[PDB]
Amino acid sequence: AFKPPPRPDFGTSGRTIKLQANFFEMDIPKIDIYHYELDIKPEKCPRRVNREIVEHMVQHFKTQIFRKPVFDGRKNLYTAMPLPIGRDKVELEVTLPIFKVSIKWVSCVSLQALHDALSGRLPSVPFETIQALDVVMRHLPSMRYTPVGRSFFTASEGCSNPLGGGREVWFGFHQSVRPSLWKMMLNIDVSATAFYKAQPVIEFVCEVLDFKSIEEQQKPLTDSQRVKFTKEIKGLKVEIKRKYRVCNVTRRPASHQTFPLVECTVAQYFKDRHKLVLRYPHLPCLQVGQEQKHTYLPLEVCNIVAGQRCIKKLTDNQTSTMIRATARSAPDRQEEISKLMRSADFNTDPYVREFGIMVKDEMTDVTGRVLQPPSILYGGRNKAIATPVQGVWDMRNKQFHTGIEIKVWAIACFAPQRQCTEVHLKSFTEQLRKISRDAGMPIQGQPCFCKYAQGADSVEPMFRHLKNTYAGLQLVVVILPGKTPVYAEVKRVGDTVLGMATQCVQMKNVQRTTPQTLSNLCLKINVKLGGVNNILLPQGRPPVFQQPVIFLGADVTHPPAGDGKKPSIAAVVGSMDAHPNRYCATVRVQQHRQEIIQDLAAMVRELLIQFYKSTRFKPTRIIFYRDGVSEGQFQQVLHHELLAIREACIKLEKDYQPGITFIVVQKRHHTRLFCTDKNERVGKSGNIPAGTTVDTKITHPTEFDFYLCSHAGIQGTSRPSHYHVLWDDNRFSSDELQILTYQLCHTYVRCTRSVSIPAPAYYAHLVAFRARYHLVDKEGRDHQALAKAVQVHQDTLRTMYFA
RNA sequence: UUCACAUUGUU
RNA sequence: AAUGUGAA
Ligand SMILES: [Mg+2]
Ligand SMILES: [Mg+2]
């Protein structure tokens, strides 16, 4: 239950395609790097400050110690050659315009062993070596650019990309060192993010408060303005030589604001001590440093410090500007990455030079294979077969495999009548019934109930009435004016309080209908009512379907940044037929920002029981798609969760041991794939075609992983999903697993398109999202409360309410 | 809330 | 959540 299976073989299905990857081959010497531990006192210093300290230590003690070491920013120092220190732990006094730095030799890192690991010779890739290489490649840019995670950012020279509110777009790149079947690879991608302008605080005030000039406000500021500004600058760093974090903004103007020196004002203090007359004394001051102290600084003497990323949310306009700034088609992105790498000068990096490393300035050529899409089987009387072309198909002249006959339904319109009239509702009903009839989901008549309502308060009593009054009620269609807290309430009542099927529609989609919109809407409706939209062509499925098999999807969605308290949400879905089409859901609230699904065993047990209830089979196989786990958590996650699945099986039945395949689905990596041949590009975005598969050259040297871009690239540059097999009792071959995954990408019911991840994982996402909606504004006893919030009604348990 | 894709995620 | 590109 510990180590990931070796790659069984290489895929052979599908026609070849020439690709380029944003992986750049690295030359690594055979020598041994030497690793030393570093302890810096005081120990609370920022990583930047630590790097500065070590740099200064090397420059001040260059004599008879040390030539060019690299530092990870905390406790790790690597050197290409040994240091005249042996294993001795020495204490160095470093004074920087006060720091005690102890150096103890830890170990040796053999790059030769890494060469053994990249070949077949060594079973595993030694992580210490990878980390060493990463510290090497990260040393220089960490002190030249602004490090953000594994990326680096900078103010692009010659360009200004203002966002408003004292913010601008900084451009940069993700850089990571990764082992491959081929060589060591430098993964390089371009990115952009919001940073605070390094402008005077006065101009920051002007941009925040919308002043063209500071003279627009000659008064001391309204409380609204002072608060609006306080919320913007609080937490940011300003300077005068001296760095300060802004903890507050004084209420009183600099002329009036006082402090004890006996009391003295700020304006006066800057007159007497600094010979400074304040040109804007009517404006307030910034309280900096410790908030228990009384250090107040005028706005005029302060600048926003450069290199501070905007953590706060961007406004709608700032976001629009951001997207316009960073919108790149696939070829445009390929060229920007290439331009970046050619101008990067990695091989002239003195620290890269010290460790004898060479980096190839060209993208790696890779051969992909474009898998054939599955045929999609429909129902009705004509039993049409749809053939996905470039990851897309449609439902024109097609009927659902199993269409629900709708006899009893209602309409609840929370939109104002003056905006969404009865005529609109009637026309909408006619159109929807036409489309529904075409799709094989006949809405046989008019709704038995159609009334207007207002506010969330009216939801529960209206729904309670509906459930009491109309026997055999199948659906309530809820018309919403737009973004409103009524949606969350309709879902709370419907899914968790009364167990009623709802379908919400925006007012604008009722006022102006299109065949396509109504079609997709009919997809959702048919699914919610227990229907089967379509199935994979039975004879076109891989042989895994010859025995009972269940498909599980799992995801943990986490609370937004700058948060605590809000729980993480874990969602697991399971297939309930042989198609596979129908799914059931399980969802739990859990510890804040925990990736490991805590209650997995119980969830899986539920899903297995329900599977048996639906199919009268016990799965001989369990295929588990696990979204969002990064490499650094493979071991922990697999250890807990695999054992959880096994436990769920054992407790269900003595000696019930279905084979488990554990795949990690990853969409948030930095691997990009591009068409080498321009004539292979698809659409306006110029992306690789749906079905593109890569399991060579840039993948793992020993393990079972692959890239599958299962979706059509509509806009920007596609993200090919990465699949990493952490465990496989079923002994899948690459071909069968890749084809299975791809086919699963075609079973997603909310659209007639192949999606970017297999339907189970996507459904898991939808479930966690709905749970987020159930928990809106609700976040021992509190865990019980939150658990209750996400617990769906009994009549909702066997449904696809999350569609 | 029709949907997918993509982006931001010592004063 | 925001913002874009699109679809029978
Ligand atoms: Mg997740
Ligand atoms: Mg959106």
The whole-angstrom separation of Cα A505 and Cα A508 is 8
- Residue A169 pairs in a beta bridge with A194
- Residue A569 pairs in a beta bridge with A557, A589
Closest CA to the C1' of C2: that residue is A316
Residues of chain A with CATH 3.30.420.10: 540-803
Q: Which helix (H) or strand (E) holds A636?
A: helix A634-650
Cβ-based neighbours of A302, under 8 Å, separated by 6 or more: A200, A201, A238, A239, A240, A286
Do the beta carbons of residue A756 and residue A667 sit within 8 Å? yes
- Asked whether residue A457 is marked as a ligand-binding residue, the answer is no
Do the beta carbons of residue A694 and residue A742 sit within 8 Å? no
Q: Which nucleotide is nearest to A716 (CA to C1')?
A: B6
Cβ-based neighbours of A227, under 8 Å, separated by 6 or more: none
Distance A557 CA to ligand 1 centre (A): 4
CA–CA distances in Å: residue A474 to residues A138, A313, A448, A504, A584: 59, 40, 11, 14, 19
The whole-angstrom separation of Cα A577 and Cα A586 is 17
- C-alpha A446: how far from its chain's center? 43
The whole-angstrom separation of Cα A527 and Cα A802 is 10
Q: Which nucleotide is nearest to A269 (CA to C1')?
A: B11
Do the beta carbons of residue A534 and residue A378 sit within 8 Å? yes
The whole-angstrom separation of Cα A70 and Cα A133 is 10
CA of A575 to C1' of B8 (A): 34
The whole-angstrom separation of Cα A299 and Cα A302 is 5
Characterise A578 by phi-psi region: left (phi > 0), alpha (psi -120 to 50), beta (else). Answer: alpha
CA of A103 to C1' of B11 (A): 39
Residues of chain A with CATH 3.40.50.2300: 370-539
Cα–Cα nearest to A239, from A155, A299, A168, A311: A299
Residues of chain A with CATH 2.170.260.10: 197-309
* Ion ligand 1: residues, Cβ under 5 Å: A 555-557, 628
Torsion, CA A675, CA A681, CA A684, CA A690, rounded to 10: -90
- Residue A106 pairs in a beta bridge with none
Burial class (CB in 10 A: 0-12, 13-18, 19+), A545: middle
Distance A761 CA to ligand 2 centre (A): 19
Closest CA to the C1' of C5: that residue is A715
Distance A627 CA to ligand 1 centre (A): 6
Enter the CATH code of domain A197-309.
2.170.260.10
Do the beta carbons of residue A724 and residue A661 sit within 8 Å? no
CA of A514 to C1' of B3 (A): 13
Q: Which nucleotide is nearest to A762 (CA to C1')?
A: B4
Kindly determine whether the C-beta of residue A468 is less than 7 Å away from any atom of nucleic acid strand C: no
Distance A553 CA to ligand 1 centre (A): 11
**Token pair for A354:** 């010290």
CA of A509 to C1' of B1 (A): 10
CA–CA distances in Å: residue A777 to residues A45, A381, A502, A784, A786: 37, 48, 22, 16, 11
Strands (E), A42-183: 70-71, 76-79, 90-94, 99-110, 146-148, 151-154, 162-164, 167-179
Number of H helices, E strands in chain A: 19, 37
Q: Which nucleotide is nearest to A483 (CA to C1')?
A: B1
Kindly determine whether the C-beta of residue A435 is less than 7 Å away from any atom of nucleic acid strand C: yes
Within A345-458, residue ranges assigned H as helices are 350-354, 422-438
Give the sheet arrangement for strand A535-536, strand by strand: A385-386, A376-377, A535-536
Chain B positions under 7 Å from a protein CB?
1-11
Kindly determine whether the C-beta of residue A308 is less than 7 Å away from any atom of nucleic acid strand B: no
Cα–Cα nearest to A135, from A181, A60, A79, A87: A79
The whole-angstrom separation of Cα A690 and Cα A752 is 14
The whole-angstrom separation of Cα A739 and Cα A371 is 7
Asked if the bond preceding A141 is cis, omega within 30° of 0, the reply is no
The whole-angstrom separation of Cα A379 and Cα A389 is 20
* Domain made up of A540-803: CATH architecture: 2-Layer Sandwich (3.30)
Angle at A138 between CA A134 and CA A140, to 5 degrees: 145
Question: Which CATH number is correct for A370-539, 3.80.10.10, 3.40.50.150, 3.40.50.2300, 3.20.20.150?
Answer: 3.40.50.2300
The whole-angstrom separation of Cα A414 and Cα A384 is 39
Cα–Cα nearest to A151, from A197, A199, A195: A195
Instruction: Write down which residues 297-326 in A have CB closer than 7 A to strand C.
Output: 314-316, 319-320, 323
The whole-angstrom separation of Cα A194 and Cα A768 is 28
Do the beta carbons of residue A524 and residue A597 sit within 8 Å? no
Give the sheet arrangement for strand A502-506, strand by strand: A449-452, A409-413, A475-480, A502-506
- Residue A536 pairs in a beta bridge with A376
CA of A714 to C1' of B6 (A): 8
Q: Is A212 helix (H, G, I), strand (E, B) or coil?
A: coil
Instruction: Write down which residues 684-723 in A have CB closer than 7 A to strand B.
Output: 685, 711-719
CA–CA distances in Å: residue A205 to residues A116, A166, A192, A211, A227: 59, 8, 25, 8, 12
**Token pair for A473:** 């009620």
Closest CA to the C1' of C8: that residue is A516
CA of A505 to C1' of C6 (A): 20
Resolution number, Å: 2.5
Characterise A249 by phi-psi region: left (phi > 0), alpha (psi -120 to 50), beta (else). Answer: beta
Distance A628 CA to ligand 1 centre (A): 5
Within A416-458, residue ranges assigned H as helices are 422-438
Angle at A173 between CA A627 and CA A338, to 5 degrees: 110
Instruction: Write down which residues 275-304 in A have CB closer than 7 A to strand B.
Output: 289, 293-297
